[PDB]
Write an enzyme that holds these catalytic residues in place. Structure first.
Site, PDB file in Angstrom:
ATOM      1  CG  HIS A  83       0.091  17.437  -6.795  1.00 56.62           C
ATOM      2  ND1 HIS A  83      -0.688  17.624  -5.674  1.00 56.62           N
ATOM      3  CD2 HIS A  83       0.330  18.671  -7.298  1.00 56.62           C
ATOM      4  CE1 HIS A  83      -0.907  18.917  -5.503  1.00 56.62           C
ATOM      5  NE2 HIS A  83      -0.301  19.573  -6.476  1.00 56.62           N
TER       6      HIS A  83
ATOM      7  CG  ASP B  22      -4.149  19.214  -0.866  1.00 57.80           C
ATOM      8  OD1 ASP B  22      -3.926  18.337  -0.004  1.00 57.80           O
ATOM      9  OD2 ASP B  22      -4.737  20.285  -0.604  1.00 57.80           O
TER      10      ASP B  22
ATOM     11  CB  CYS C 281      -0.900   0.023   1.238  1.00 60.24           C
ATOM     12  SG  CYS C 281      -1.963  -1.423   1.437  1.00 60.24           S
TER      13      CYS C 281
END
Lengths: 247, 246, 245
Positions: free
Chosen positions: C220, C224, C164
């Protein structure tokens, strides 16, 4: 073109999952970033600027505004906007935008600066007009005004365009430095991280100075490394001396 | 492919503008850079090297070249060239080029290094031949000459090719660190930023040492993270110990 | 498309060369990296964490198991595994994967972390499952076993699937910081560089503290700037306040 495709794997094979459709805004952001990333060859410069005297000045000015009751708070990002604006005057090529076919460069004569602001819907970038022609007090009122408007989400698209340059200060949340992505069609972006008292050599011994770390990502098609170093240096020098205040 | 186009904005809704065509040389470089940016997955390593003794050695050396009138200034980048050259021998995989299809790696036995020099039209990268077989005096002498040639714009195409590796030293202008783009078909590039006197732990107390910050961007298809760290450490150890130099 | 082709040069013109064909593995990972680099808009955050107390506690624990001869060495990266797993809990959006078209986000409830391990054939990333459920001593033993296995080159398929989040600690070999590439279809990756004793301001003087530099690259499109800063701060805070365990 001729590269491998996204890695498709069954995640439920490892445990419980949950799928969520992104908001329409998050999609537009993701689309712009994918384009910006691929099309703009990024170079990032890093630096640190001594803001010891800037900080004492900022507090000094807030006190003066308090005694005569002006209801205005001067944040350090105001000085950053001014330092950036001054730098865009001396190096006009940073105040530009490259054409879609990468053939022509549009040099902008006006100076508008976008400032990343945290909203409950993540960061958004309002644009402040004529930063070079406005004083600290007026910009501070604008920042104050735009702040609450930002956190409420009562923002017009018109307020979020016309930018020549972007400033993103995330130091209040952390990091010692970071490498941001340029906001097309602009050609550069300044990142600002958390300040810290550091030992600075004076020539005989180390002295505690308040150092502000900054970073500059730029479109390498337009700006070369030497020019990037000159630009971040000017910002450094400007911030580390507030004689620019006495016009 | 299937992504958004470049934003179109009528910039004159905002104030005066001036559109200008790029120079011939500019369109070529920006076109090279776009290719380099998307075809090379970049990883950037950062580091700092103690050059306290190297600085004292350098000022000592060309004060003697002044004593014999050798007409040569030994710049710091000359030592960085030798340190890089030595590292390229110790890890040949850095001195190479990947084929277009990414199946074949060409290991080069020769060592030429491109060094960024500033000119009226921006940074250019002339290539210096057999860096591992040349001395400090000889390289410095070439450097003075070639840099002078670069500023007048009289550089030849032959002096611009054969590069195995690139050094870009912009510390004389600023920055504490930077992340540059690899110049294909090369595999790695070393950036050099501004040096500073910094407090360094000796085991009992902090002492002032001159620290030079360096950065290494490399093609991750060819070079993995551990080897990148090993490579920049060698450069570090070579510059922080003048024994390895000579 | 409308872009220059890869440069074509005859290198034998400049001197002796030797062309070598890549192994299958090397070709495969290089193809993966080429896609990841182009498809993932990268942002890298940097930070430093005070691990002075962590290191003193870690050495105490090792000396204890030593006298008892329990055959277990606790390395710093195990604490980092726990810190990251904890952060993955507090900020679930980092525990996720974005769809091929970039319209859908798969939030995961399980916490598996890949950790870069060095072998004769370079770094490989074996996956450790349920880090949020496992203790420091247990993970340390798992790490020892899988590391020996990797160096011998005996890792199964499943032993390297299901990650993960990726942690790559190359600080034992050098660097003060670095910017790694996100290991798709994961969303972020934490790099760890060499620790060093640094002077830290306490309000009236500089005192020596052991600072560990860490870096965070992330997709991104999903994360953020603000949340990137929050995420790296949690890891920082968790590592510096070991009490938090």
């Amino acid at each position: 073109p001729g590269m491998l495709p996204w890695p498709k794997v069954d995640f439920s094979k490892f445990g419980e999952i949950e799928e969520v459709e992104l908001g329409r805004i998050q999609k537009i952001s993701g689309a712009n970033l994918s384009r910006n990333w691929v099309m703009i060859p990024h170079v990032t410069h890093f630096d640190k600027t001594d803001i010891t005297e800037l900080e004492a000045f900022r507090k000094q000015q807030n006190e003066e505004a308090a005694k005569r009751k002006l209801d205005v708070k001067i944040t350090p990002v105001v000085f950053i906007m001014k330092a950036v604006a001054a730098a865009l005057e001396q190096m006009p090529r940073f105040n530009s935008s490259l054409s879609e076919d990468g053939q022509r460069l549009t040099l902008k004569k006006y100076i508008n600066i976008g400032v990343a602001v945290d909203t409950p819907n993540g960061l958004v970038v309002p644009v402040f007009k004529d930063v070079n022609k406005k004083g600290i007090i007026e910009l501070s009122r604008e920042l104050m005004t735009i702040s609450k408007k930002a956190r409420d989400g009562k923002l017009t698209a018109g307020e979020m365009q016309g930018g020549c340059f972007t400033i993103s200060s995330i130091g209040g949340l952390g990091t010692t430095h970071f490498a941001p992505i340029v906001n097309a069609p602009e050609v550069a972006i300044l990142g600002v991280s958390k300040s810290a008292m550091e030992p600075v050599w004076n020539g005989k011994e180390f002295v505690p100075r308040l150092m502000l770390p900054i970073s500059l990502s730029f479109d390498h098609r337009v700006i070369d490394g030497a020019d990037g170093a000159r630009f971040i240096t000017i910002i450094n020098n400007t911030l580390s001396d507030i004689r620019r205040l006495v016009m």
